[PDB]
């Protein structure tokens, strides 16, 4: 295929619409295998969840997980 971006003309990738966490940064917000084909999509910032603000309602946790990252 042939697909046009803001970074340039990208041939070989099949443009899609649903967003993903992006693999191979291409530029101008567009990244790039998934089921035997190369897909070039828009980056996703992640799952969009806006939390339920009130003027009088708090939310307090009831359990925790002590976890070990590395660095």
């Amino acid at each position: 295929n042939v697909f046009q971006t803001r970074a340039g003309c990208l041939i070989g990738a099949e443009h899609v619409n649903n967003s993903y966490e992006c693999d191979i940064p291409i530029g101008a917000g567009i990244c790039a295998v998934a089921s035997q084909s190369i897909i070039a999509y828009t980056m996703s910032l992640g799952a969009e969840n806006s939390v339920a603000y009130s003027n009088n309602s708090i939310a307090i946790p009831t359990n925790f997980t002590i976890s070990v990252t590395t660095e």
Binding site: G29, A47, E48, S50, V51, Y53, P61
Partner: protein
């Protein structure tokens, strides 16, 4: 104000030095791998400009969304929270106070995180710190009413929380008013973004000398 990234400029070595010539290149091949060596250095910092903006902004997991109704205990956030008319209000003034072309071998790769994405991260960072306070940085974002949050930050610096409530209405006015003077001090006084302008001035002045040297 802090700069966080410079323009991901890149330069093709052989096309700068030779510029589409066969006689010149076969000479440039005798200088070993100078061409390969510089080209790697320049894309080493171009790929790093993407790690700078990915660290300052991409600190949050999910993109929080600010609520429709805005009842923030009297605190008026109209200036910072985004306006769908176009990006926020103050941000819009910032994008007007700066004065940000390729010839031969030179180029400007575009930044990976587009500006309307960078403007989006800074909205979640705004909608988490308005609604949730500290916690959207520590784990599951717990919501807490703003007028109560500022009480829990007054309890930070060593002021018992009663002070806020007992002065809530005035405190909200000072804060709302202080935010107002910002855009005024920003709009009126030019040379307010001295720091960001240099990193544009220097880095573009330096490119200019690179081309003048072709003559």
């Amino acid at each position: 104000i802090l700069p966080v990234s410079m323009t991901k400029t890149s330069v093709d070595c052989t096309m700068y030095i030779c510029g589409d010539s066969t006689e010149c290149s076969n000479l440039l091949l005798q200088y070993g791998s100078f061409c390969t060596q510089l080209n790697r250095a320049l894309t080493g910092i171009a790929v790093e400009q993407d790690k700078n903006t990915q660290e300052v902004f991409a600190q949050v997991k999910q993109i929080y969304k600010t609520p429709p109704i805005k009842d923030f205990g009297g605190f008026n956030f109209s200036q910072i929270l985004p306006d769908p008319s176009k990006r926020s209000f103050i941000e819009d003034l910032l994008f007007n106070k700066v004065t940000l072309q390729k010839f031969n071998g030179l180029t400007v790769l575009p930044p990976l995180l587009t500006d309307e994405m960078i403007a989006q991260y800074t909205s979640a960072l705004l909608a988490g710190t308005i609604t949730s306070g500290w916690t959207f940085g520590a784990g599951a974002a717990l919501q807490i009413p703003f007028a109560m949050q500022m009480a829990y930050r007054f309890n930070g610096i060593g002021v018992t929380q009663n002070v806020l409530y007992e002065n809530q209405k005035l405190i909200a006015n000072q804060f709302n008013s202080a935010i107002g003077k910002i855009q005024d001090s920003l709009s009126s006084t030019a040379s307010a973004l001295g720091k960001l302008q240099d990193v544009v001035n220097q880095n573009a002045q330096a490119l200019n000398t690179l081309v003048k040297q072709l003559s």
